[model samples]
Target chain A: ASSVNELENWSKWMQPIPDNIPLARISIPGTHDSGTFKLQNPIKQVAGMTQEYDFRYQMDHGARIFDIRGRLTDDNTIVLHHGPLYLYVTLHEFINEAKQFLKDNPSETIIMSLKKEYEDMKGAEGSFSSTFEKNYFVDPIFLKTEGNIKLGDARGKIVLLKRYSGSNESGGYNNFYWPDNETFTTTVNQNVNVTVQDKYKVNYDEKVKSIKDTMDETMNNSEDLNHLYINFTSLSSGGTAANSPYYYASYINPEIANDIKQKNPTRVGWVIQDYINEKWSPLLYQEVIRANKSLI
Target chain B: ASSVNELENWSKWMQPIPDNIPLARISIPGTHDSGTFKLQNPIKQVAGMTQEYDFRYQMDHGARIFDIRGRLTDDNTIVLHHGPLYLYVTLHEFINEAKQFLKDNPSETIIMSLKKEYEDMKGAEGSFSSTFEKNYFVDPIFLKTEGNIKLGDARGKIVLLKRYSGSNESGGYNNFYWPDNETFTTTVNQNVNVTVQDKYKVNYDEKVKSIKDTMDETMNNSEDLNHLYINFTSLSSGGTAANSPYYYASYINPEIANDIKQKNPTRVGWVIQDYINEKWSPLLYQEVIRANKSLI
Candidate 1:
């Protein structure tokens, strides 16, 4: 038999140490959303400016920098560096203009110019009838607008817009194709008909609630927010501006979507009939580029 | 008449109570010694190496290079660094050679020929006298010795040599007068002679005891038996070999005095004698000097 010392089994008898319980408060400034994902470290969003989200006690460690991203409800996106509850905008005037548009055209469907360009033309001119819904898209614009007005101080309030589209009647040549006779069936009863749909829906809701509560409870918990903690300094803290207002006409509240259809039934019909076309919608967060600019 | 809620302090009074224990830990390296003491800051020392000991903590801080007069026991002394601890002579070797000479001579008084020559007498008389005591008096030899020796394995054992003069003789004119003349006077025959009283016995005894204690402690605790800490990268650590040992000797201990009588002492004399010549005594540390034969 081996002796106790000879076997050296002491390590087996040891107990595991427990993790430390934190006892401090934290806060992430300049973020409208409650959570920030993809955040890994503290970084200089801008020279001489530092923001941090703290969810724990004792942040005496040397400060560092980080980058972050996330999403919001409005189709309206936001981005900003996380700091100690201090927010600054790179282009306040642009944000103000977009916010005004949102207020004036609270129900208007905004499309990115880049995405709309692809759908605006159907092969060539006269290919589709005047009644056919035209699916237009545009480049993502960094602006919180309803139409062309900036989204003023509407804290906790948001207007969500969604769009979609599908193939139309006159068989396969009604909207996407031409020469509906002979090559295509146009009969309403026994014709090889097709349907194209495009619709937009708007929902008024709160984009965020208690931004401070979320920040203090999770974001700036330590000197470094990216290390398993909340990072407010990330430019994507609010969300990606490229794709914010994601909407499906079918899934929208019927009462809300129906009202949207009354204003631009054809456009709304295209959105409702061709949900896939919604991918080209101009919905986006305006704050992302601004945040990036400030950081630079 | 003053209600807490009615005064300007109402806001503070109504504020949620803070935990009384305002304890927090801050991560700050090099706060205490570095920020407060100029010498503790390596960068500052590098820039102001040759400045006088004007900064607080420059003298007795953790890296004290020299001992103040009378600070330690009678012979206690320390080495100081102008910048680094480099010396022309190694204190270790200096002490060893001095000890060897002491052993060889036994009771015979001997002076250390600080293996190097003085800066003023470098080429003329490069060799040091084995019997001449090097007392660090004017320049900063004692400071340099302690500082230089501090670099080796020793960390705290190095000390400066202090020298004390033992003569009341004026320069040139009364240079040859015997030190014992003050205690007794010569007189003519029995009936016409005068008597003298022993007025200074107690004071003399106390002074002897103090000097003896200082010498004993200094010799006993030198680098030979103690360790001293030092940083070698310091510029003050380097020096020319010639007067390095002498530099150390002058500052480390009190000088031996009264050269005339010290060179030749009488066994019995009627006059009381004051020792005039001072001897350079190395404390616990040893000093050494090496020459670059190729360059020499």
Candidate 2:
């Protein structure tokens, strides 16, 4: 193959990569505001729409990490939300798709980045963290194995990248200090160190620089097994056409993909981007998956 | 224009850029082994050729710095050489091109990086440094202006970037401690702090990373007026097909260009590269020239 057509059958792409390699060293592709794909109305499309495709499509297209933002509903279930506007998708809906994908491909692991993005419903029975642990994360499909996750152990399961406070769960990646609109570093657990670039409020130049800065850090320190780099190539500004996430993704997605197509690093961290479509040639997710071939 | 087509008349691309900004802060395109374009024959093509075009072509296409490797010949004049192979092009040949270019577009200043590339001829009356000083640096076109040169002061002139030892002249980015095929830093003069990435002996990935590491330093520290960043995105290994400089540049040039196309930083230092051509989409020289738009 001139290049890996793994983006087509992305679920089994990890099969070729060695099982002994830690997930931290592997390049994983993710989508920011993963559940916001449903915002199709005129206003929702411009203001909050991040992903143009659904969860199943994202999973099939090589996106392993999903930045799921949720709010506890009145009935105590977690529903995906982008600020006040509910993203018509439920947490269970996403997990079911992931569950089916893992069952079909058995060699894959999904990094479900759960964040309490908005205020919980007024009459919820439990706190946001408790509701998630009880209703969503209790399933066997969600890996309960702790410490630095390896490909062998994480296969056929969901690796929870917990972002909410007061986590009652004992397994998966522990939540760390994530400052708003800034690149930061912190210890998620004794075994895991995370360096994140989440400066989502900046212009195209600033956001791209922050992404490259974190990615360069990841590539240079490829020997570190415990370090996890999470770089977000997504930006937002709130009003006007240029303020939309799609505006930035249209350019950032292809630009970054072209860069990876040329440089071809073995690791690019778990890059969580805005759009998850192939409209941008050399899809971002496929390049991330391609980087894993070095592990073999 | 959606993107700058300034590549057409790139010689005058600097016309609108602020004149007060020091040459160190500008994004300048340069060619590595700039005088080796004459090595078009079969054997010389792979082993010695670094640039595909002549100096005038490079200047018109936005190249400002020329990496001129010369040997003091049988006569007192210096002639371009790559190791033992004479490049057919002379120092005087390159100077004439630069003179014509600066004459046509007076706003641009050419950085002439001269080095004693090979052994001086046994019958030559003078040493390499003395020959260049007497024959070349004596010209009125060469800017004898010292310290960090600004665009206003450098217009329509040749800025001598001395790389050979035993210099009796002073001006245009002084020669410092260049520790060979590694990225390093040192003070050129009291006012100039130069950070350079010239890892020409490594693989494709290592070379790109070194180029990026140095560039990131330049971008993050854009406020530093006295610091000069010289990143060489060219690599060579002497034997085999992949060992050729062209092989490495085929990937590095386009890759870095795509990166700059996306990130679009204000400054990218004095980027010296191999293969000055447009066969690669989003030409490296064009992007480097476009980066100077921020200075406007």
Candidate 3:
């Protein structure tokens, strides 16, 4: 929507964005299961896997938010997991990846959505929250800003979307009650609100409508800066019977990207999707990046 | 979706279409008011005019159905009318244009949605319906095949979507009850169903949802051949305050066209819209024709 499209060099797209705007006001692209690219084991790959590339590829292609699900390992480190299976990646590795990416492009910031995916090990040194707090959240690289983060305050830092409990630090987005497999809304505080469309169990027909409905609300009410719309445009196509993420993403990515193509909305919410790839005719993340022109 | 894109020659895009498919099943493009181009007058042009080109341009650009609202004039000839204002064009002239278009490309068929727009003239020879049946419907250029018209039977002929009363001859699509300014459905016979989305009074938000809902039904029900879906994607954008047709068409054409582009539906119903022109980035008629590749 800008006179010149900066999609190819999308990693530093926020360079042109003014610093005064709230981070929630910008239309940001994110990955649903950011670390599930390496899960090529067997049956769970069809059910659990999501991404096709590494963190560097995702960040370079305009994905700013990372949906990082992790478990507290016995070694007191945080490794990513999707349900019971290990995603073969650690929180520190992803944080280091973001740190290097920010070093290369200091104008950008990454939002990591950290969740306690599964139960802790019997030999684990501490609780899930305790391990994460002591090991990961203490870094200066992670911004400890309170309330809604502004772009001016978030540069060269990993903003935490705290989906785990018992965190001592007051920073990033404070996670609230997210109802499973349905679009829901809950208040973070008296001034802040978060609306999420995470209807993962529904089939393609219902799923497309959920994405569209949430997007319509965001596009219409774009002037509201305090409200956050986090729309997860990811759904399994055929459950465990198929390569469901690829199957669904092949259709939904282009479907939603095309919808956003027609409407150059100032705000398109924070689109978190599965299988973010250029193999799609019109890649979904590029459209999300293009929708941020109003902020510039 | 086809490997080769023939949208530039969209007028003959139906050349590859087989003769066995019923006309009701094919995705067709139509003009809302086919002949209001010459209205450069003061106030009526802003409210009533719908197009910017002539009949030849419309047919050349792949508009198959003509929403020809005619008033029986003093000379017993039917002339185009938009509400009370005469559109400065006659039915015979449009028929001649289609006749020439069919001569040029014998593979295509024209659908004329003939509606009695206003009351009959004082010096007219007969009633509005009788006048049209006697003077126009009797011509050999108009096809007289009854029941659901097949493509094989409709070549080089004008298929009438009758909206006037007292039609003595049974041919093309039969006239039925049409609810004013809302999407509705009615049965032509026990085996046949007609669903029309013609919500013209609503604003941009409701109007878009109306079109999408109807299109979703048509896309999902592409296998049913006996059902006729006529969607009027036209609405006055600002009442009589401005160039309402252009104002609305500028937004709705690209919106629905982008939706159709993402979904290569086998059938997209008959899209009747105002202001059919190539100035739009993704022209509406071209997308409608491209959707017919599955039929081929």
Candidate 4:
């Protein structure tokens, strides 16, 4: 019986080349007599019978092959032995096993571990690579530009131009700010007493208290205090201030400024503070401070 | 051509019914006519033509019919027109119009305001007439009572049984107690003093200070001051006893009484108070206390 050694120990027996056909052995030519009694016997084994032989190195295509080796010993007892043989196997199995082994032993260097993983998953599922770029999309065009009059049908492309400039010079105004020449005149008349005395008519504390009291009373009566007067004088009293061109510009004719900017581009900064105080019409209503109960 | 006045008024035409024809008045008989003309020729108007003359009289179905008429008049110009001629209308068109009217005016009330809603939906749809009972359905076998073992599937049946007993025993216990032996032994051992009383021993005030300082050190090592233990041993000083159960129960058990009640059901009253304090197994540890810092 042959020793059941590990595969590495039987490395010499794993071969397509046989050991009996020696290349050199002290040049002992014609050691066996040509006319020996076994010359007529075709299947003659001179070595020991039942000798184990490894068949690991069989083919170049990685296909396994088995070999049966038998020998007739000096007593003429024949024996046989056979074993599996393959130089290499299916790379997929080796790859899987190698990967499992590497995974079990994680003490290996990270680079080697990663290389093993990549080799294991070389043709596997879901392999991806990516790169990113900055600022991929362009800004949209504005409306009423030099390019196109009509807008193309694109989502979120409409540009609306808000007319913030006033048009007091033209004639009309936005809904919120109306012309008010009467209010400035009324305030001037009310303040006339202050300028002559070179001081406010009432002391500061008294003035504040009076204003607060008047505001409280006004607020108390506001809901029921309907302005029933239908005269033009009452309408004038309801209008915006007149003196400041900003007041007039933002009130009387809001569209005129926009038009003027488009038409008369040269005439700029025509209105000033002194010009507003002296020449501009008086506002119709004086703005009285009222308590906003909603804030409270 | 009729005058506008003639077109507006239809009282004389609508009031009298002709003898030759079945003049079915679809309106609620007892309700007031609120100055409006409901259609007597609803079928003709709905069908968009006059062809067949057949009418079904149903109190509840008639109300639904009247609702359809009101909806049509409110939405369209169609109104009542009286004549001796018998009209024929396609019933399919009438049904379609009624269904469409329901779909459009989904929120509107269908029946007459002054009349009670009569449930006569059976005659409206014939298949429903067979399923409906006058008041209630016939009781199936499943609704009946079963034998003692309930052999068959007598489901959905009401079962009532009489139960009687002789002795009247209440379901609650009072003054019932259990001895906590393990805790009692532990408590007696903890209270056993190792020091022997001697004349040259430390004075009472000095002993008290020493005990306080030891307690402070122990408390400093504790994770929380609230859970720290301070065994204040009174040595015949100021009439305060050294190892009184009352002091232990009042000072210690109250702190952990609620917790003990939650953890164990047998813990109650003053019997095991001192034993429970001596064996105070705080259910928390350093790691647990640290983890529960936010919760505490």
**Per-candidate DockQ versus the true complex?**
0.00, 0.01, 0.01, 0.00
TM-score of each model, paired residue for residue: 0.15, 0.50, 0.51, 0.11
Q: If both were scored by TM-score, which would come out higher, candidate 2 or candidate 4?
A: 2
Output the better candidate (1/3) by DockQ.
3
Residue A271 in candidate 3 has what lDDT?
97
Q: Order the candidates by lDDT, highest first — what do you get?
A: 3, 2, 1, 4
Candidate 1's docking class is incorrect
Candidate 3, position B229, lDDT? 93
Who is ahead in TM-score, 1 or 2?
2
What is the i-RMS of every prediction? 30.5, 23.3, 25.0, 58.2
Binned by DockQ into CAPRI classes (incorrect, acceptable, medium, high), candidate 2 is incorrect
Q: Give the backbone clash total of model 3.
A: 0
Task: Give the TM-score of candidate 1 (chain A).
Answer: 0.14
Query: Please, what is the whole-model Cα lDDT of each candidate in the order they appear?
Result: 0.20, 0.81, 0.82, 0.19
Query: In lDDT terms, which candidate is top?
Result: 3
Q: Give the lDDT of residue B117 in candidate 2.
A: 93
Model 2 local distance difference test score: 0.81
- Report the interface RMSD that candidate 4 achieves against the true structure, in angstroms: 58.2
lDDT digits (tens) for residues B41-153 of candidate 2: 22232344677788888888889999999999887988889888888998889999999999999978888999899999899998898888887898999888788889888
How far residue A255's Cα lies from its native spot in candidate 3, in Å, is 0.8
